[PDB]
Structure formats: C-alpha cells, structure tokens
C-alpha cells in the first residue's frame, strides 16, 4: 500500500518528466538568437530616499507609479512621494520585525507583516486624519514573508509555516488556505489578471495556485536551494524565480518547464529580490553581493549592473508604468534608478 | 514648487524631525536575540527579568540596566529546522542562547543547535551569551547518581575539572565536574571557528537566579567594547 503509493508517485513523476522532455525541443536562446541583443544598460540614481533608521526589507510601488511604501526593522513603514522625495507618511509598527510590505491597488490601504505572524493592514485615507490599524489578520503559525493585495477587500499572504492564505478583509478569516509546500514560502506574485498567483518556497519549488478554487495548479522545480524571490511576467504566462543558488530561473506557465537560467559564474551570492520591467525584456535581480543585476530575459546575459548600495539589496520593485526601478537595501537607503537617454 | 508642494515639504520636514527623535532611541538601545530549546528555561528567564509581550510568534521584553535599554526577542512557536528568518537578526548586539543543562537526552541536540547557530553565515560577527540554565536540576540529578553522563557522553571518564574553574564553596565537586564538562562541550564548538570575529560568553544560572540582567549588561559592554576597538582602528 504505502510502498505502492510511493512507487506510483514515482511513476507519475517520471511520466511528468517524460512529457516535459517531449514538449522540450528548442531552448528559448536558440529561438531568440535572431533578435538584436540589448547593449550595455546604465541606470542613474535619480533620487535617494533618506530617512530610514536601519535595514529595509521590503517596498512596494503604488499603482499611481509615484507613491511608494518601505518597511524597515525600526518598526517603521515610510510612505514616500518618490517624485519629490517628500515623506507622505510614517507609520510606527507594533512589531519591529516586518519582512514584507504592500500597497493596495486602490491606494487606500497598506499592509505589513513579519515575525509577529500577524498581517497588519493600515487605512491610509481616514477621516481621523491619521493612520490606524484597519485590521490585524491572524491565523498564520509562522512568520509572514510576503503579502499582496488582490483588491481592497481581498489579500494574499505567504508564511513560514509552508502555507499561503487568502484573507477576506471584512471577515478576517482564511477564505482559502494553500497547503502544498514543504518548506518556508518567501515570495508570491499576483498575476496581472489576479485570477492565479505563484509563490516560491524553501523546498526549491515554486507552486502556482488559483485564488478562486484554491489548489496548486502547477509546480515548478529546478532550483538547487531555497527560492528567495518570485515575480510574474507582465503577460501573466510566465514568471521568474531567484534563489540562494545565485541563479535566476524563468518558468513558463503553458509549457510547464524551465526556460533558461540567468546564472553567471562570477557571482555566487544568493538572490534577494527579482522583478521584471514593463515590457518584460529586462529582469532586475538584487543580490547579497551588495548590488543588483539587469539581465535580458530572452538572451540570459547581463545587460547591466545597478551598483550604488553599500549593503545587500533586500527589495526591488518596478513601477506599474515602467518609469523607474526602486531598490531598497540594508543601508537604510531607497534608490530610485532610471534610464539616462 | 507651489504652495501645496511647500506644505508637503514642511510635512516631510516634520516627519524627518520625528525620525531623528526616534533614531536617538533606536541607537540608544541594544537588540538581543533570545534562542534556546523549548524546554531550556528561556521563558523562565524572560519572566524572571521582566514581563514579555506576545505579538506562536515574537515575544518582546524591554528591560533597562544602568540607564541602558536592552530589547530581548524570543521567537517562539516556530519550527527551528533552518531558522531562515535569522537574516533579520544579523545586526543584533548579542544572541542569548539558553540551554538546559539537566537534560542529557536533549543535550546533544542543544549542542548541535549551538553548532548551527555559531557557524551560521549571517551570524558570523554576532557574539553569543551562553546561559546554562537550570543548574539546580543538574546538581540534583548528578547528586542522585541514577543517571550517568558516561553512557550519554563517553569522554566524561577522561575529563577532569579545569584548574581555571571557580566553584561555589558549598557545592559538590562532582557537580563542578559535570557543569564544567558541559561548559567545555559548548566552548569546544565556540572556539572551533569563532577566533576573532565573535565570542561566546558562558554563564551558570538557575531559575531563581536574579542577576541575569547584570550578566547580560556586562557581556554587552564587552561586546560593544570589542566592536569599538575594531571600528575605531585600535584593532
């Protein structure tokens, strides 16, 4: 029985690998060999957002592409007007340790979470004139690593208990609980259509679920270590995983395989953040090596380096309109890089 | 810059002033990361020193010694198989590792956990304050004699009490040998790799012990003294 169950699981896995190999005929590099490779890309730090007291673990651009929110270990969530560097808001936090933050798609709310296992969501636009805890979501038995907003009433969180959760804000209860992961889940990326969402974990696997029904639609493996960051492709049919093995791997939803590995022998430090550009051609990945890399998502070459941070780049986000890329590192500094020409 | 942008700028200036006011306090206090086995009396030390504030999760305990504030962080109700959140605590002043010395069944697991914490990549420069808690229970158990450390550790037979060791005058010599054998077991891993970057401070404490705050303050003073020696180009 149990031995037979393991044997049939192994046969199903082998059939999966055989089907993937049958579907695999040409690497995307061979297809893109005819495209013009992008030249060296240099990005200037237009603004530096000074004011955080310690290392910054997360940031999230607003959907207006102007306001951003950043979370640091001093128990502080600072909302900056990136255009003029002005500090729009400064929210003190109940727990000094938050490893994530988020911005509501409407912009009315912000979210944070960390080692307290509670997702604290704050209402920015209150008649009270100040910021208050709109809700404190509880139900996770591990540290919360990343939370993203489907809308003003639905949120999606991932935690260190190898579970993700979909929370209805009014009820404050886990509408759906995604439990298919073996290791700790770090990063989740909401699909542009917000019907599916992917999340990478410690078991060297990225699982893509659907929010409505709530089962693991797809599972992607290939990484050798814990997957640290994840980001959906702008079209929603692919995503990218950055892990501790110092390689970024691009997975394709429809093919259900691994496209290429953005790995360079020069760099050995693991990945801390991965995100795409508006057109999806540039993949920007912050590393433990105190600087970020910018690869060509279809040629797997290092098209540029973003090196202005004295410490490791913990978080890195791209505006919805693709105007700039804001990177927050452990030296308390958020740098808004942008093109030159 | 218009009127509204100027008002936003003054709002940002007020926020920056509040940020500096908070930076004073943040730099004024030292953050300590408390770790230990589930049974290793860590909550007992936390309660004996001060009162914690939950919110499984984070346990905050702010205590003041000699006008210096320390902030102990107990990460409970979590699976300690990798401690992958430890990257958050890569800047703590000290890691307070509390180990129950009266459980030889879990003593090897505690030693392995200390080996993992000491040789951790992110805690390379973070010093460890080692609290060998529950000394009274250890003394009672080794005084009873029905439990032998020899069957758990075969190097106890060839182990002798160090000449450095300072025991209490009314304390049994076998108690001293057991205590210092466990302390040397920890210090072996402490000295295997931690030569200059960080140090392990061992302490013998019990549940009724009340000077743990003073020991933590002194160890933090030594840690910051060495940190300033390295930083101010004296080392």
């Amino acid at each position: 029985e149990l031995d037979q169950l393991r044997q049939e699981a192994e046969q199903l896995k082998n059939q999966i690998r055989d089907a993937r190999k049958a579907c695999a005929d040409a690497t995307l590099s061979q297809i893109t060999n005819n495209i013009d490779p992008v030249g060296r890309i240099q990005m200037r730090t237009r603004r530096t957002l000074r004011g955080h007291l310690a290392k910054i673990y997360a940031m999230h651009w607003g959907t207006d592409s102007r306001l951003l929110v950043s979370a640091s270990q001093d128990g502080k969530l600072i909302i900056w007007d990136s255009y003029t560097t002005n500090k729009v808001h400064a929210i003190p936090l109940r727990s000094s340790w938050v490893m994530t933050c988020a911005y509501a798609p409407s912009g009315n709310y912000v979210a944070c979470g960390g080692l307290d296992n509670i997702c604290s969501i704050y209402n920015l636009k209150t008649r009270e004139g100040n910021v208050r805890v709109s809700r404190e979501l509880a139900g996770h038995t591990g540290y919360l690593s990343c939370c993203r907003f489907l809308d003003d009433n639905q949120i999606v969180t991932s935690s260190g208990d190898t579970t993700c959760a979909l929370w209805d804000i009014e009820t404050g209860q886990q509408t759906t609980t995604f439990t298919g992961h073996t290791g700790d889940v770090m990063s989740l990326s909401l699909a542009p259509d917000t019907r599916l969402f992917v999340s990478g974990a410690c078991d060297a696997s990225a699982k893509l679920w659907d929010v409505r029904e709530g089962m693991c639609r797809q599972t992607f493996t290939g990484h050798e270590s814990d997957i640290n960051a994840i980001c959906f492709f702008p079209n929603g049919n692919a995503f990218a995983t950055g892990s501790d093995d110092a390689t970024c791997r691009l997975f394709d939803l429809r093919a259900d395989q691994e496209l290429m590995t953005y790995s360079h022998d020069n760099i050995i430090c693991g990945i801390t953040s991965v995100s795409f550009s508006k057109s999806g051609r540039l993949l920007l990945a912050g590393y433990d090596d105190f600087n970020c890399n910018v690869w060509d998502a279809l040629k797997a070459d290092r098209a540029g380096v973003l090196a202005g941070h004295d410490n490791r780049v913990s978080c890195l986000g791209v505006t919805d309109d693709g105007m700039a890329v804001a990177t927050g590192s452990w030296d308390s500094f958020l740098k808004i890089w942008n093109g030159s020409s | 810059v218009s009127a509204e942008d100027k008002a936003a700028a003054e709002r940002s200036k007020m926020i920056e002033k509040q940020l500096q006011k908070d930076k004073q306090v943040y730099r004024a206090t030292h953050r300590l990361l408390l770790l230990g086995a589930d049974n290793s009396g860590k909550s007992t030390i936390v309660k004996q020193m001060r009162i914690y504030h939950g919110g499984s999760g984070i346990f905050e305990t702010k205590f003041q010694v000699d006008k210096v504030n320390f902030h102990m962080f107990d990460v409970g109700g979590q699976r300690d198989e990798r401690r992958k959140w430890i990257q958050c605590f890569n800047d703590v002043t000290a890691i307070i590792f509390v180990v129950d010395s009266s459980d030889y069944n879990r003593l090897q697991e505690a030693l392995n956990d200390f080996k993992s914490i000491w040789n951790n990549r992110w805690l390379r420069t973070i010093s460890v304050i080692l609290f060998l808690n529950k000394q009274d229970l250890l003394a009672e158990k080794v005084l009873a004699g029905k439990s032998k450390i020899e069957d758990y550790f075969p190097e106890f037979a060839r182990y002798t009490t160090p000449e450095d060791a300072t025991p209490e005058p009314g304390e049994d010599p076998r108690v001293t040998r057991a205590k210092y054998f466990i302390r040397d077991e920890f210090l072996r891993i402490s000295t295997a790799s931690g030569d200059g970057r960080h140090y392990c401070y061992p302490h013998f404490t019990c549940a009724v012990d009340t000077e743990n705050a003073r020991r933590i303050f002194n160890d933090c003073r030594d840690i910051i003294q060495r940190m300033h020696l390295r930083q101010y180009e004296l080392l």
Partner: single-chain antibody, 230 residues
Framework: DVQLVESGGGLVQPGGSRKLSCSASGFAFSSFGMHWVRQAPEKGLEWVAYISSGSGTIYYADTVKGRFTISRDDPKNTLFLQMTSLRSEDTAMYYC??????????????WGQGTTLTVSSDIVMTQATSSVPVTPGESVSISCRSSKSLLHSNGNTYLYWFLQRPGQSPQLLIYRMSNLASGVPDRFSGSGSGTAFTLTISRLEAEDVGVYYCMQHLEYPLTFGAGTKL
C-alpha cells in the same frame, strides 16, 4: 467626531481685542494645518489666516496683516485667533478650517460651525453667473474664470469648489477639478482648462440647494470668488 466647534464673538467695540476659539474633537489636530476664513453677511468668502502643522509657517491676509495673530495648542487641540483694533468690516461669520497637505489629500476637509462677530498682485475670481433656476431634475453647470491659469508644472490645478447650505456651514465638493470629496456623492463633477472652470451636476436634488463657491490655492493670498445662488 471630526467636528470643529467654535466659541467667542458677539457685539464688540472697535478698540477691544477679542479671542475667537475653535476646538477640534475627533481627529488628529497636531498633524493638521489650520485656516481662519471670513464670510461677510450675505456676501462671498475671503481667507483670513493660515498656520501650518507645528506652527512652522504662518501666513496672514493682506487686509488684516499686523493686527491679527494665530497660534495652536496641540495638547488641548485648540486654535484661537487674537484680534486687535477691530474694524467695521470684521462684522462677519468666521470659520475654522482644517487642512492636511500631501499627495492625494483633500486639504479642506471639514469647516466647523463658525461664530459671528459684530462690531458697532492677488488672484481674482470672476464667477459671472450668480442666479440659477431652482428647478430640480435638470443638469445645471456652474462656470468660473481665473485671472491667471491655475495649472502648475506638476499638473494639479489648485481649484476648490464648496457648497454652503442656507443653514449649515460650507462643505467641500471638490478639492481639485478632476477629483471628488469623500462624503460627496458621485453626482457632482468638475472639468475645465486654464482659467475656464466648470462644475457639472447630472441630477438635481432638494439637498443640493445652496451657494456655490470657488477658490484658488496656487497663491497663499487664497482669494475666494463671489458665490452663485441656485
């Protein structure tokens, strides 16, 4: 909650100084800048004074410069105007108005129930139209003009539209032409270019009867405009 009560006023002599207080209850007064605004009897409005959060910036109107003062008591959540050498033109309604300034904010949120005072260059607003039929169910548009275009380099045009009910304090309708206040229903809208400003109402209800006012915020003289009665 979020209410600005006011006290003081009454019949006063021209040579007597007066204290006119506004107390804020139900919102964070410390982080809000404040304004004092005057309403002449059966006339338009005119901004009198302003003080930023923390008393960093204090601005006074050109007509009352040198004899008026403002200061804030944050622990008591109080803002009082001290008035010296009262004139015959100070016989008017007075309103204490909260104002918070950041990106996306509506920096005239609540106008408290003011107090009456009885005594025994700058941007100008035209608002040529002054009388409109009170027939409901129509689609009335209220027009306005500015001496200088309110559009700035940033992109936001600092035009504000208020409605003052016959027996209640004025309320925000629009804090900027392309956006609408919180408590105001989706019935109102604003649109325009340069100096030409228009307020549009799709359907007219009985609670929409009042006086409409327009204001600029590009220049801190903050001169109002002559109201329009429906």
């Amino acid at each position: 909650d979020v209410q600005l009560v006011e006290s003081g006023g009454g019949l006063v002599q021209p040579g007597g100084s007066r204290k006119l207080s506004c107390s804020a209850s139900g919102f964070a007064f410390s982080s809000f800048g404040m304004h004092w605004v005057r309403q002449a009897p059966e006339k338009g409005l005119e901004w009198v004074a302003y003080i930023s959060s923390g008393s960093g910036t204090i601005y006074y109107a050109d007509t009352v410069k040198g004899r008026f003062t403002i200061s804030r008591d944050d622990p008591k959540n109080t803002l009082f105007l001290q008035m010296t050498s009262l004139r015959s033109e100070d016989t008017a309604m007075y309103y204490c108005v909260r104002s918070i300034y950041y990106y996306g904010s509506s920096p005239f949120d609540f106008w408290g129930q003011g107090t009456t005072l009885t005594v025994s260059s700058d941007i100008v607003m035209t608002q040529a139209t002054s009388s409109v039929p009170v027939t409901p169910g129509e689609s009335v548009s209220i027009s306005c003009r500015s001496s200088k275009s309110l559009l700035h380099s940033n992109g936001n045009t600092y035009l504000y539209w208020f409605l003052q009910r016959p027996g209640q304090s004025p309320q925000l309708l629009i804090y900027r032409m392309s956006n609408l206040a919180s408590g105001v229903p989706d019935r109102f809208s604003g649109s325009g270019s340069g100096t030409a400003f228009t307020l549009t109402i799709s359907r007219l209800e009985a609670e929409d009867v009042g006086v409409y006012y327009c204001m600029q915020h590009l220049e801190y003289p903050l001169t109002f405009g002559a109201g329009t009665k429906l």
